Amino acid sequence: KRRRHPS
Amino acid sequence: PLESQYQVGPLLGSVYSGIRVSDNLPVAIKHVEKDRISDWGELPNGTRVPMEVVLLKKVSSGFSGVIRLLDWFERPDSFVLILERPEPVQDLFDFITERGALQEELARSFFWQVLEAVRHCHNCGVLHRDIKDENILIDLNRGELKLIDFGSGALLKDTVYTDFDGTRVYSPPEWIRYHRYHGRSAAVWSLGILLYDMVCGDIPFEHDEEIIGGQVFFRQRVSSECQHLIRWCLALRPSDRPTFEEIQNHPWMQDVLLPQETAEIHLH
Numbered sequence A: 001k002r003r004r005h006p007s
Numbered sequence B: 001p002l003e004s005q006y007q008v009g010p011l012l013g014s015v016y017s018g019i020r021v022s023d024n025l026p027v028a029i030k031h032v033e034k035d036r037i038s039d040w041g042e043l044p045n046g047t048r049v050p051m052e053v054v055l056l057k058k059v060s061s062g063f064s065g066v067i068r069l070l071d072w073f074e075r076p077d078s079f080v081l082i083l084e085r086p087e088p089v090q091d092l093f094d095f096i097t098e099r100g101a102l103q104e105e106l107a108r109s110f111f112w113q114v115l116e117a118v119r120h121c122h123n124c125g126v127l128h129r130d131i132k133d134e135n136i137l138i139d140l141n142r143g144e145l146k147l148i149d150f151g152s153g154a155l156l157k158d159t160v161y162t163d164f165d166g167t168r169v170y171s172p173p174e175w176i177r178y179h180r181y182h183g184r185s186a187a188v189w190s191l192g193i194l195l196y197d198m199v200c201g202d203i204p205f206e207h208d209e210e211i212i213g214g215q216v217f218f219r220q221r222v223s224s225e226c227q228h229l230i231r232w233c234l235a236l237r238p239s240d241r242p243t244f245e246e247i248q249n250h251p252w253m254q255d256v257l258l259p260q261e262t263a264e265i266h267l268h
């Protein structure tokens, strides 16, 4: 699982 | 003028697609709520805008690998930024999600272009502080990368930073353990993260313990030269990290493709 990471 | 100097369209991710009606230039229309801003600055003329605007003005001069601010407006409760929108475009996070781990030749061309863009920033006295694949757009026809989202940025300084609002998994171990860093050395760390992301198809570290352990396991086949550059960027000690000059003189960085070659070979 590859995911985006918020600030 | 405001709502009818730009015909406005659909949401991108609060950022809208727009066209500047005076000449049909594609643009992106970004809205930022005054409540959600913690950093402010003053433009050359003295007046007090969000840091984001200040930093984009400083780097939007000339051509570069950075998305340029064309205009902006204040509203009672928000600011609105009009930005370049290249078309067709895809951001590097989606590009990697779909293509997987990039071929080294392609990763080298992208990474070099990101290095040129970040050097451009630093030359204008601007530190981005959120370099990552999601803050990079690929113009697919020209093979050109553009940096976006200066919202966590700061004026470049040589003294220590004790504040940080970027992405933790791209943040360096000195930030994790001590809540302090220096700009260039932190930027290089995140450039190591980004490079691993390109050649491996995902970031190396998800958890704080992994970040401070600095153990870089390679999940895809990656040349020794590239593994070395990445390990160098990801040195635990900031002063052991390479300068921007040493990165661009690294053996793995030689014979880079031009943007148009990169598009023709890998994007068209």
Ligand SMILES: Nc1ncnc2c1ncn2[C@@H]1O[C@H](COP(=O)(O)OP(=O)(O)NP(=O)(O)O)[C@@H](O)[C@H]1O
Pocket: B012, B013, B014, B015, B027, B028, B030, B031, B032, B067, B083, B084, B085, B086, B089, B091, B134, B135, B148, B149, B150, B151
């Ligand atoms: N030319 C462009 N400039 C900025 N964003 C764009 C552009 N074209 C497409 N986008 C999309 O808009 C998304 C959000 O932009 P970004 O500048 O990262 O704002 P943000 O910091 O996530 N949120 P906020 O600034 O609070 O609205 C990006 O991830 C892009 O996919």
